[PDB]
Paper text:
Tripartite ATP-independent periplasmic (TRAP) transporters are secondary transporters that have evolved an obligate dependence on a substrate-binding protein ([name]) to confer unidirectional transport. We investigated the significance of this interaction using the sialic acid-specific [name], [name], from the [name] virulence-related SiaPQM TRAP transporter. The first structure of a TRAP [name] revealed that the charge of the carboxylate group of the ligand, sialic acid, was neutralized by an arginine residue, Arg-147, in [name], which sequence analysis had revealed to be the most highly conserved residue, being present in 98% of TRAP SBPs of the common DctP family. Using in vitro, in vivo, and structural methods applied to [name], we demonstrate that the coordination of the acidic ligand moiety of sialic acid by the conserved arginine (Arg-147) is essential for the function of the transporter as a high affinity scavenging system.
The [name] mutant protein also crystallized in a closed [name]-bound form, despite effectively reducing the highly conserved charged side chain to a methyl group. In contrast to the R147K mutant, the replacement of Arg-147 by alanine results in removal of all direct contacts between residue 147 and the [name]. Rather, two water molecules dissipate the charge of the [name] carboxylate, mediating contacts between ligand and protein. One of these water molecules (water 1) is present in both the R147K and [name] structures, although the other water (water 3) is unique to this structure. Despite this significant change in the binding pocket, the structure of [name] around the missing arginine is only very mildly perturbed. Water 3 also has a higher B-factor than water 1, which manifests as an anisotropic motion perpendicular to the carboxylate. This mobility translates to the neighboring water molecule (water 4) that moves by ∼1 Å with respect to the wild type, concomitant with a 0.5-Å translation of the β-strand that bears residue 147. There are no additional waters present in the void left by the short side chain of Ala due to the aliphatic patch behind the arginine that drives it into the binding site. Hence, although Arg-147 provides important contacts that are essential for high affinity binding, the required coordination of the [name] carboxylate in the binding pocket can be fulfilled by water molecules allowing these mutants to both bind and close around the [name] under these conditions. Interestingly, we observed differential growth phenotypes for the Arg-147 mutants, with the more conservative changes in the R147K mutant exhibiting growth more similar to the strain expressing the wild-type [name] (doubling times of ∼120 min), than the [name] mutation, which resulted in an ∼50% decrease in the growth rate, giving a doubling time of about ∼180 min.
Residue numbers in the entry: 1 to 309
């Protein structure tokens, strides 16, 4: 094709992210009259999300996914997106990114500093905790070996609840669970399904600890080369795909607990009051480390009403 473009992702071929990326690719091919074709590179073939963000910056990868929270790697205050229990729901995540001064500035910085254009934002699920033994209360987290991504906020979730985190690449998690190198992991339900972590975990606890969004990002090097009518095709397709992507996750969160029960998984509902209480010293450390910018981001986000209006 005139533009042979590439979209990399950590998620695999059985995932919501991949399905939505397929919809995106199909719409762009059709509405560009075949001028643009987008090929998909799942399961971290090109590296992880940190690596793929570097490839967008350099112009060697055209599209990828990232959470708003991932930008904490560059702007420490952006950890507010994944401080456990701070963002209440997806409604708040959306307004946090697009309708706060903090969020609007982050979008500008992604463009200026990091070579990426934000096309759309989707919901990617609320993280829960699976394990090889029941989590009936926060006491059961003590010493639990928990696989987490290489991200400060997930490491902190594990630390502050009393667990023992092992950070690793997403591709490595299944084997870690299967071999009992670790005792558990903490992705959203959709990923527990997609990766078939249910095959190698007997328990699921509704910790509801971190809310994931998902940004459709394009390399500025690629987006600048597309005539404006093709920029519009890509932007519109990303917005349409994001709506679909969100719906896949919303519907799954309704249906998946029953799916897991049918596969033999036991579901628990630990009291979350102590989980939330345990994060108070982490929020204080966040404010200590990130200073006024962090305090301000927190204030802006805490001001957002979570009820749709
Ligand atoms: C966009 C993207 O790659 N998201 C990935 C996230 C983020 O890397 C992490 O939450 C830090 O932001 O990690 C996983 O949940 C994980 O490894 O458990 C897999 C998921 O596909």
């Amino acid at each position: 094709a005139d533009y042979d473009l590439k979209f990399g992702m950590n998620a695999g071929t059985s995932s919501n992210e991949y399905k939505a990326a397929e919809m995106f690719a199909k719409e762009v091919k059709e509405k560009s009259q075949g001028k643009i074709e987008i090929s998909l590179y799942p399961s971290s073939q090109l590296g992880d999300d940190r690596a793929m963000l570097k490839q967008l910056k350099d112009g060697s990868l055209d599209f990828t996914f990232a959470e708003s929270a991932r930008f904490q790697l560059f702007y420490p205050e952006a950890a507010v997106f994944a401080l456990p229990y701070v963002i209440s729901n997806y409604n708040v995540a959306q307004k946090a990114l697009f309708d706060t001064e903090f969020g609007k500035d982050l979008i500008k910085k992604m463009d200026k500093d990091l070579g990426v254009t934000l096309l759309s934002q989707a919901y990617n699920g609320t993280r829960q905790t699976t394990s090889n033994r029941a989590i009936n209360s926060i006491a059961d987290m003590k010493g639990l070996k928990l696989a987490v991504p290489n991200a400060a906020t997930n490491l902190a979730y594990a630390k502050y609840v009393g667990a023992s985190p092992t950070p690793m690449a997403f591709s490595e998690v299944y084997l870690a669970l299967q071999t009992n190198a670790v005792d558990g992991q903490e992705n959203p339900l959709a990923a527990v399904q997609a990766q078939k972590f249910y095959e190698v975990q007997k328990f699921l606890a509704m910790t509801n600890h971190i809310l994931n969004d998902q940004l459709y990002l394009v390399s500025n090097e690629t987006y600048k080369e597309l005539p404006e009518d093709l920029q519009k095709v890509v932007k519109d397709a990303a917005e349409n795909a994001a709506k679909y992507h969100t719906k896949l996750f919303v519907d799954g969160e309704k249906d998946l607990v029953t799916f897991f029960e049918k596969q033999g998984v036991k579901i628990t509902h630990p009291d979350l009051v102590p989980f939330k209480e345990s994060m108070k010293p982490y929020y204080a450390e966040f404010v200590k480390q990130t200073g006024q910018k962090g305090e301000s981001a927190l204030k802006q986000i805490e001001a957002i009403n979570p009820h749709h209006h």
